[PDB]
Structure 1
Amino acid sequence: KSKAELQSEERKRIDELIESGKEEGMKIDLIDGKGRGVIATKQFSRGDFVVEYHGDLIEITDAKKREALYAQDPSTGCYMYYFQYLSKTYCVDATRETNRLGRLINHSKCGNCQTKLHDIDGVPHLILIASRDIAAGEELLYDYGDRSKASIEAFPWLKH
């Protein structure tokens, strides 16, 4: 198959996974010093679609607003994910507690999952794809991105 045929087959598999909302081969577990963490129940190959970073979609401050009220109450964890979806800050605020698993994935700079923008007829979709072969039992992790001095001062685990 060509490069275009493989990309179309990879896009059709990603579109079906985003539509069904299936989060198979993944279960919640209590990580030591991280609250909730996502761990693999089956072997995920390199390049395989893991799970969508699902939540409430909106504009730039259209996610950074519940920020200024979620700072007013520290208990609700930081679950906002900003992104540049075609020149405009388009995000997915997963602050509300749901059964979706993408919002519970922990941080690691050298983890086993990369965050990418997956467009489906105009509507942006944050997806988590396996950067390498993820072993069964191991924790699913991805680079959170916020390497700023204010954020790293409050929780030092963002650095590593």
Structure 2
Amino acid sequence: KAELQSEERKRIDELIESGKEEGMKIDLIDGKGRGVIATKQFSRGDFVVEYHGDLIEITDAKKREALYAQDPSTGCYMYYFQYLSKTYCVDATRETNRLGRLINHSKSGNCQTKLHDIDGVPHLILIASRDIAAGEELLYDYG
């Protein structure tokens, strides 16, 4: 073990809250376009990056969705989930410098999502679903 689990949790909390993202970079994938590449090896289970965005409840998510007035054909950055009796939305619509929202989707990726609680506040993170080689495209799937 619990000590090591608590200590790894602390390192994940510190990375999440620091504002820093390492071990990855934006690159153009041949025949695909923009994507995120691992610039270091990842082991199955390792923290990759947060899917960073504003955490809001469903009422505020509806207010935001109504006001963006963006066309739905271009995709949505608002992700919904339930956590301890509440429904939340991680709204990553804002065009920030964060890499989590840039990781492409795949029918079989090397990143999976997990909810990571920080003092009763859930964070949507990407963890490695298998071992990842440096240079591989980071690809998520829901799962």
Quick one: structure 1 residues 144 and 35, their matched pair in 2 at CA, closer, same or farther if it must change by over 3 Å? farther
Helix, strand or coil for the counterpart of 2:53?
Answer: coil
**Residue pair 1:114, 1:130 contacting (<8 A) in 2 also:** yes
1:70–1:76 Cα contact (<8 Å) kept: no
Over aligned residues, Cα RMSD in angstroms? 2.2
What secondary structure sits across from 2:70 in the alignment? coil
Distance 2:115 2:79 in 1: 12
SS state of the match for residue 142, structure 2? coil
CA displacement, residues 56-111 of structure 1 (integer Å, 9 cap, x when unaligned) = 11012433443345564357642111111211111211111001111111112321
Unaligned runs of 5+ in 1: 146-160
Task: Return closer, same or farther for 1:91/1:110 CA change in 2, 3 Å cut-off.
Answer: same
Higher RCO, 1 or 2 (CA under 8 Å, sep at least 6)? 2
Unaligned runs of 5+ in 2: none
CA distance in 2, matches of 1:65, 1:32: 38
Indicate the structure with greater strand content. 2
Secondary structure in 2 matching 1:64 = helix
Q: How far apart in 1 are the matches of 2:29 and 2:69? A: 24
Given that 1:83 and 1:90 are in contact with CA atoms closer than 8 Å, whether structure 2 keeps it comes out as yes
Q: Give the Cα–Cα distance (whole angstroms) in 2 for the partners of residues 64 and 118 of structure 1.
A: 24
Are 1:43 and 1:136, in contact at CA under 8 Å, matched by a contact in 2? yes
Distance in 2 between residues matched to 1:139 and 1:64, nearest whole Å:
33
Give, in whole Å, the separation in 2 of the partners of 1:61 and 1:142.
Answer: 27
> Normalization by structure 2: what TM-score?
0.86
Following TM superposition, by how much is the alpha carbon of 1:18 offset from its aligned partner in structure 2, in angstroms? 0.8
**8 Å Cα contact 1:56-1:93 kept in structure 2:** yes
Question: Which stretch of the first structure deviates more once superposed, 66-75 or 5-14?
Answer: 66-75
Identify the match of residue 90 of structure 1 among 84, 88, 97.
88
CA distance in 1, matches of 2:109, 2:2: 29
Aligned length: 143
Query: 1:120: how far off?
Result: 0.9
Q: TM-score, normalised by structure 1?
A: 0.78
Instruction: Check conservation: 1:116, 1:126, Cα contact below 8 A.
Output: yes
